[model samples]
Target: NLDIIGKRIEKIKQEHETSWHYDQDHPYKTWAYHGSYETKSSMVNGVVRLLTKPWDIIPMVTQMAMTKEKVDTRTQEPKEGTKKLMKITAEWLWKELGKKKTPRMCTREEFTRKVRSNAALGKWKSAREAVEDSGFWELVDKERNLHLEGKCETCVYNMMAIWYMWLGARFLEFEALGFLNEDHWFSRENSLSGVEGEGLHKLGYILRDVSKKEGGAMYADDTAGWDTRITLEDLKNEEMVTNHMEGEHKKLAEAIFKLTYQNKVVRVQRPTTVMDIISRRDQRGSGQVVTYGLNTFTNMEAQLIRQMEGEGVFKSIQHLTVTEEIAVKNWLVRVGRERLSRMAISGDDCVVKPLDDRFASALTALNDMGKVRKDIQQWEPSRGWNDWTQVPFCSHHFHELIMKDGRVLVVPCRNQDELIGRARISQGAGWSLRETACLGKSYAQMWSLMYFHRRDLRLAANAICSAVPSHWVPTSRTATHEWMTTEDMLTVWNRVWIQENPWMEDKTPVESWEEIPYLGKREDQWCGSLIGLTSRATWAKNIQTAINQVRSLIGNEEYTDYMPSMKRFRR
Candidate 1:
């Protein structure tokens, strides 16, 4: 079946090249074409074209359209013809390449070849080889020798503690140490300032002791700086290690012991003899295989549990009934689900609360504008956009007010006129306060504008200068470089709000005066903001604000940047 498929593939490749319509003037075309020549370059080009433009397998349709008179006007005819050809070609290809074989038709050699070539299986085989060379068995024998000599009364227990700590440190190093070392360069350059870097270095020290040292202990500071050394004695002092003897290492020890003894009745409570320990180890090993995913009874019995099942001269033992296995598996699954649910709920709360606050602020701003507009309309019936009797609300707009003492004040609307108009209609007769607050389309538009503006400003401020849009000019500056201001961000946001035309046909008096200078640029900027946003701008702003506040309170000398202490060690 495989040989037939290989022949079919070769036939299809030849047919494709012969039937293909070569486009000489096509934009992607190259000048390396020759008729009836099958060079390596030409073969590569054929494959590239086959992958890129597979529809070209239905030959002569593109050629037909290219040569036909009135090609541009009769586009649909060629398209329909090409589609039909594609369907026919696909059916023919499928029929030619199809194979029929039963499940048992696969040969043992073929199956073995595929299994051997599997990437995961290869890695597992390598790992097994490494484990054989890891001195685990040798270490176990050494501990047993000491136990037999009666020199170390608690040798097995102490060895178990060391094993547990070694495994813990090994797992930590694989999972998190790699990430920290790569991202922060903590291990490579320990002189860098940060509590996290120092803490990571300390973690590395512990990892080195467990992974490199025999019996997993830090005996002395012979190679580097001075630090408290951990030994087997220190580990054995813990009540959990000496008295309880309940850990992964203990389980491993028992598993090993069970494997070494076959003709023994395994005790569930406590292991006494070396044979009992070997029996316990086998029982634990079989239990783990069942608990994880593998079917221990059906698939793993020969390799793992056959000895305990009285293969040859060993005694047969029933570890657990089917009912007990089912109940334990269900309990494990339930515990896992509970832990995942707790983590997910807390994570969701932290992520969602900030978004809700931003929405609330936007709605608050809209409501405040609406209240002020309503009060002005009620007080003076003749005052409005057309009547010109209203005074400006904020400094941005200009309006006159005369006092009895003959003094005049010019007031302008601090808020954008377009935003004010939207707010007025948002709270108008068509709806109640509740409906206007959350249900209105205008509210949604306002919230989106505020959200996206803040998002874009942060992205623009933090991005490498070349990545930022060219049109945006910074509103304020330090000695080194300029940065955006809140006022300028608000202005751009108002421009975006107006461009959306939230009030539809109801134009405000100030509409004519408002115009976005770089309309296309603004659209692109907003689109980029929606795609990605960063936290660098917010962090910089927070640090700058803290510095300014501290300077004002202390009357301190100006500092350009925050600097950490130069001292290496804690005093």
Candidate 2:
């Protein structure tokens, strides 16, 4: 008989090393690892839909939804305050232009003449026609007529005031830098203003700078005023030399060492602040985020289950059949039992290293095997493919597990407290180590789903925007589950945590795509508060102000003359 474990491990490594969905065609199509790029445009972008579809989610804008409403507020009400959008996006643009004063002047010649061109259909029609078909033009016809002209011209601007006034100028400057330094331009991209999108630039720059430090190549800084000679290829080669995953892996290893002190026997003292680490993350669990290597195990589990089920392994009442069911149950039990045994001695005496390599070693193959099974957003492979589930209390299953008597065996993990309470320590050592580890892993995974009051309120706001038939937004607590793809987890990481960072390759999961601002700075920080102060917006004034700015800038610049055409056609 084949050793199923060995075969499974082998297949896992084989499958992950060459999965088309992951390695060949990652969801976010990232250009860096763990979002490790050295300049702008390195943060992950969504899919073809983002490039080819209507709604392109700008980061800070999308993030505001999370910070403001704290729900799956993405598809619901765009919970982001427009002011923050402006401040941040503008800040991003400002930083993008960092000290570069390239020639980027705008004139009427550069403005749109045929604002009503075919290309303008989706991007600028409504506003174009709105100005054209006016009782409105009658009010200010002369001024409106001479305003501007062009389609692509407008697509690059007309987004909002922030973009029109500042962001556009910055993009123009950056573009020029790239244009002039055709040779060294690639090597010279730097941080813009050190504000909002700084994290976007930070990791990218870190990796990019590593190339220069490594002396991989030389390039000519002929554009940004540095008349130095350098080769673009050399610069790229140098940047590639510095790997984010290697860096993060080193961090994990170090953290583990700090916990263990390099002793042969590592002691992990429990009753420690595990919950503290887990509660802080919006999308992952501290102990289970896959950074320590659950993505592989989870993927292996998924694939093995699929293959075994297909081969008629086991069956169960929960719709699992034959060996397929048995395989997973057996695996879970086996793993759970082992974890239970290891974790059996609870209540704070279990002191071990910070990212114990043992844990890392256990699932190294599984993480690779699970490569194909990733989030749409989490592809930051630089951080060694750290999955969100690698963190404490970070669980992938959005499902909540209550005890047999409805006492919440795994109290719905809303925070680190709820997660800790469900563990062995809180459970009075009744739940076995198997139960603790299983629950700990599961609890860590549960944070991927966000259920909150602010989000429901945000839903109401969105319903108003859409003019829905019913006010379905709830006042009471409600729940929904979504998983964060590893790619998404990578995109969301900005702040570095102490215990273990939520390492990822690129983007996160699509199914885990709830609207809550899982990866955003705290709401308090959003109000331009002092760095250490986290605040949430209880009012919508800042939001309204941002909206006003967006309206002033990109307000009537519709892509299609939809309303005017519709009205004329209808009439």
Candidate 3:
């Protein structure tokens, strides 16, 4: 059976390479493992065309776009009163810097550049100290970028903290330390379909009982320097050490903990790593996203599902026949393709348009999967996947179930949510909020698909990124009754909630948060947020307004970026 499926995927890949017509070129590719990596590079580089080639996945000029907009605004036409505010800010900064240095020697441009460089080098503390020594603590008081519009101290602190963690606990960095002093880089190289992507870094002696309360104390340090000399156990137990460290060290410690904890769940047998923890994150009620169609579960996926079930992630398990999986995939594609078509592209950017009914229904399915639930609820079998009726929703026939009426029935799922909401794609250094949310949605669909297909809940983000559209069409199964075994469907309907999507060629049917676990909800505290605040344009405009008010009280005129200016700052 497995060999047959594998052959089908291979055949599909070859056919897609020679057949489909494309509309336009863009920077996107379905990272399919079944395809050759070199071939993927060619497809991306435009040396060869894949048959289903819709467009070329070119490199995005994200930075160039943002730079052009800012440049245009600065020299020719600043937005409305922005130029006046800019002049005032420059004037204020000049006076502030003038208090210490001669005006000609160091202007606003040089001062801003030097401090940020200082922050980037993890010398934030020393940089602030130097400014304070010149007797201008008030001027540098929460200094932000003049052109970039930001405060420097917080950014500096965040950079210093993260760089410190990466240097000390980066998988390879710590691995090297262990190599020289007698430790291993990662506990073991994790295996996924024979690919070594992420591994576990071992923390020694972090026990359940003793370390839970009093363990992380010995690893605390006042200077907060990288501890390559610490015990291999110390490195593995980095979070425990952070538990006892003061201030910034403690914060970074927590940051590192979140990066690695999800991969380390003993019960799930998952090797949580920094790679997918953010992009393909897990949560209660979370499942995979299917932006494209679906990729049938392979051997690797099956192994993962079993491991997760063994760990108790699922209360019970079931399989969707090939045809059943197709039905589900087609249902999803029906929704996804429409929403994607409705999305309007302006110039190089894609804008999310208002969803029509069909599109709205698709989003509703995603919303149901993503919401963080506060309590545990069992999937009622008789309602959703169990309520099998061949009915039309819009123009498409939903092989799965809804109650006899229009209400949704809860499908098959675990007692608790494991991988729920789609992990947000960490937009890179560019300002490309490019409606690429589809990538993440597709990722979520794959995750849920694997879970329902194999009762496993640990598909890596890379798997989806590297996924090729399967050769297996949704309508592949021949005998619907044999494919699903109506007896099996009835049995499942009698027991649990149906899995998310149900289908096959043979014909058949079935289916079926919180505080971000461990961490609190405040954005200031999330490790990802801290990293983002360091360089990303995340500073609020209000902070600048506050500084302007203080300056006005001291006799300088108030700066106004907002049209009505200091109208909101009054006494």
Q: Which candidate is the best by TM-score?
A: 2
TM-score of each: 0.13, 0.18, 0.17
| lDDT for each residue of candidate 3 in 1-571, tens digit (9 for 90 to 100) | 2231233234334545653222233111211122211111000111011110211121121111222111111111222222222222223322322233221111334444444443222222444344335444333322212102211111110111122221112221122111211211111121111111111000111111112231111111011111111212212222232333354333433432333221111000012211110011121100011100001111122222222222233232233344543443343334323322222111111112222112112211111212111122322111111111211111111122234333333222221112221132232333221212223324333333322221112222212222212121111100001112212222433232223222112223333201001112242122122223322222122334333332343243222232121222233
Model 3 regions lying over 4 Å from their true place: 1-164, 167-317, 332-335, 339-552, 557-571
* Error in Å for residue 552 of model 3: 5.4
Worst 10 residues of 1 by lDDT: 344-353
**Per-residue lDDT for 1-571 in model 1, tens only?**
2231223233334654643333343221111221121222001111111111212332331232222111101011112222222222223222221222111111223323433443111122333342344464354345445323322211211112011112211222122112222233211132111112322112222222222322211111010100111111111111111112234333332322222111111111112211111111111111111111111111111111111111111111213345543433343234322211111011001000111111211221111111112223322221212212222211222223332333322222222223222222321243432233222222222322332223322222222111112232222100001112223333444443333233224332222111211113333343322222234334333433433443343243323221111111113
Report the alpha-carbon TM-score of model 2 versus the true structure. Answer: 0.18
Residue 336 alpha-carbon offset, candidate 1, angstroms? 16
lDDT of 2 by residue, 415-501 (tens): 322222222122222443232223222222232222211222222122121221121121111012222122222133221211112
Q: What is the alpha-carbon lDDT for the whole of candidate 3?
A: 0.22
Predict model 1's lDDT versus the native.
0.23
